[PDB]
Enzyme design. Structure first.
Site, PDB file in Angstrom:
ATOM      1  N   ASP A 172       0.130   0.752  -4.927  1.00 18.14           N
ATOM      2  CA  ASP A 172       0.593   0.531  -3.562  1.00 18.14           C
ATOM      3  C   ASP A 172       0.149   1.642  -2.625  1.00 18.14           C
ATOM      4  O   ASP A 172       0.771   2.706  -2.586  1.00 18.14           O
ATOM      5  CB  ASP A 172       2.117   0.418  -3.575  1.00 18.14           C
ATOM      6  CG  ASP A 172       2.710   0.181  -2.204  1.00 18.14           C
ATOM      7  OD1 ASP A 172       1.966  -0.146  -1.254  1.00 18.14           O
ATOM      8  OD2 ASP A 172       3.947   0.295  -2.096  1.00 18.14           O
TER       9      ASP A 172
ATOM     10  N   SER B 113      -8.857  -0.579  13.703  1.00 17.65           N
ATOM     11  CA  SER B 113      -9.882  -1.611  13.716  1.00 17.65           C
ATOM     12  C   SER B 113     -10.426  -1.794  15.132  1.00 17.65           C
ATOM     13  O   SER B 113      -9.701  -1.611  16.116  1.00 17.65           O
ATOM     14  CB  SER B 113      -9.312  -2.925  13.180  1.00 17.65           C
ATOM     15  OG  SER B 113     -10.235  -3.980  13.342  1.00 17.65           O
TER      16      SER B 113
END
Ligand SMILES: N[C@H]1[C@H](O)[C@@H](N2CCC[C@H]2CO)[C@@H]2OC[C@H]1O2
EC number: 3.4.23.22
Length: 330
Positions: A35, A199
């Site tokens: 994770d 992004s």
């Protein structure tokens, strides 16, 4: 040193991925959920409340000759889906795909919430976010990667998740045969303890690319792609009959639909998520309503590039002094 381990979807939908991890002496192999959105290594154990264990493999520290109680240390964590676990702490030898860390904090669960109990395939979590998020008190502990880092050939690990197929976690090296083209690296903020990046935009299907900054985290421990409501609405508007259902808990779409791809930007590069990756199947067995793999982050507080996004790429988690993230097509 290096390590290389195969990671395997827990079910036909890729709801999560499990990776075998060797703990203790002799080895006890547990299948852990790697994770990159958390920083605790915790396991079902001989100390876990019996009624909360249902099929999981447990760690028994009393059977490990290298286990030592980390005296007075406790831990308690809660996650984004409302799940939680807590307990005490041992140090022990932990190996992943041939890479060994001695004195790793192994957090033994005394209690786990229902979602964990119901997940018979997941024996615990191995956190790979920054150690600043580790919950052990009063002495915060380091992640497996943090502990391994100095010994690694290169201070990196990579995630190569498969679509409805096994993939690979590598530690300490970049497998240049595992991706196509070049790797585009992008800056990381560690201010919140995550692999947080920005992004450069998105496209829906064959549509034009929208240049827009989307701050989010690369999180292998989250199943879906969680993005701003504007972006998510633009995606599902291209699927006839798709709608957000408050009763179901997100966007659903007709199982008869053909889903468009979703593109996200990494610098000037583009990662294309095929439409099939965004299908998470009937909301209940036999239903003709299917659950979408792109969902709104509005009720979360952060955008999450989860498995739906990451499995479309070869992803480099660069833990150099100034951390960065790399993405390549594959
Ligand atoms: N992102 C977290 C997730 O919310 C947790 N859930 C608990 C049950 C599986 C999963 C549901 O998706 C799990 O633990 C930490 C990490 O992955």
């Amino acid at each position: 040193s290096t390590g290389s381990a195969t990671t395997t979807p827990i079910d036909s939908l890729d709801d999560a991925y499990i990776t075998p991890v060797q703990i203790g002496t002799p080895a006890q192999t547990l299948n852990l959920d790697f994770d990159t959105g958390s920083s605790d290594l915790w396991v079902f154990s001989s100390e876990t409340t019996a009624s909360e264990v249902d099929g999981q493999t447990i760690y028994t520290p009393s059977k490990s000759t290298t286990a030592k109680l980390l005296s007075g240390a406790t831990w308690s964590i809660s996650y984004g889906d409302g799940s939680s676990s807590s307990g005490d702490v041992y140090t022990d030898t932990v190996s992943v795909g041939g890479l060994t860390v001695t004195g790793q904090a192994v957090e033994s669960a005394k209690k786990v919430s229902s979602s964990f109990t119901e997940d018979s395939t997941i024996d615990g979590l191995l956190g790979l976010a920054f150690s600043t998020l580790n919950t052990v008190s009063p002495t915060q502990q380091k992640t497996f990667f943090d502990n391994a880092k100095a010994s690694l050939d290169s201070p990196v690990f990579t995630a190569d998740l498969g679509y409805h197929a096994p993939g690979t976690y590598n530690f300490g090296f970049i497998d240049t045969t595992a991706y196509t083209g070049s790797i585009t690296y992008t800056a990381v903020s560690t201010k919140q303890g995550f692999w947080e990046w920005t992004s450069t935009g998105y496209a829906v299907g064959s549509g034009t690319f929208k240049s827009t900054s989307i701050d989010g985290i690369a999180d292998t421990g989250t199943t879906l792609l969680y993005l701003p409501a504007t972006v998510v609405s633009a995606y599902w508007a291209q699927v006839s009959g798709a709608k957000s259902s408050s009763s179901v808990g997100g966007y659903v779409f007709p199982c008869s639909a053909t889903l468009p791809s979703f593109t996200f930007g990494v610098g000037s590069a583009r990662i294309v998520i095929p439409g099939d990756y965004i299908d998470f199947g009937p909301i209940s067995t036999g239903s003709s309503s299917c659950f979408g793999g792109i969902q709104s982050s509005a009720g979360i507080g952060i955008n999450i590039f989860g498995d739906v996004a990451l499995k479309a790429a070869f992803v480099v988690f660069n833990g150099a002094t100034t951390p960065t993230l790399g993405f390549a097509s594959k």
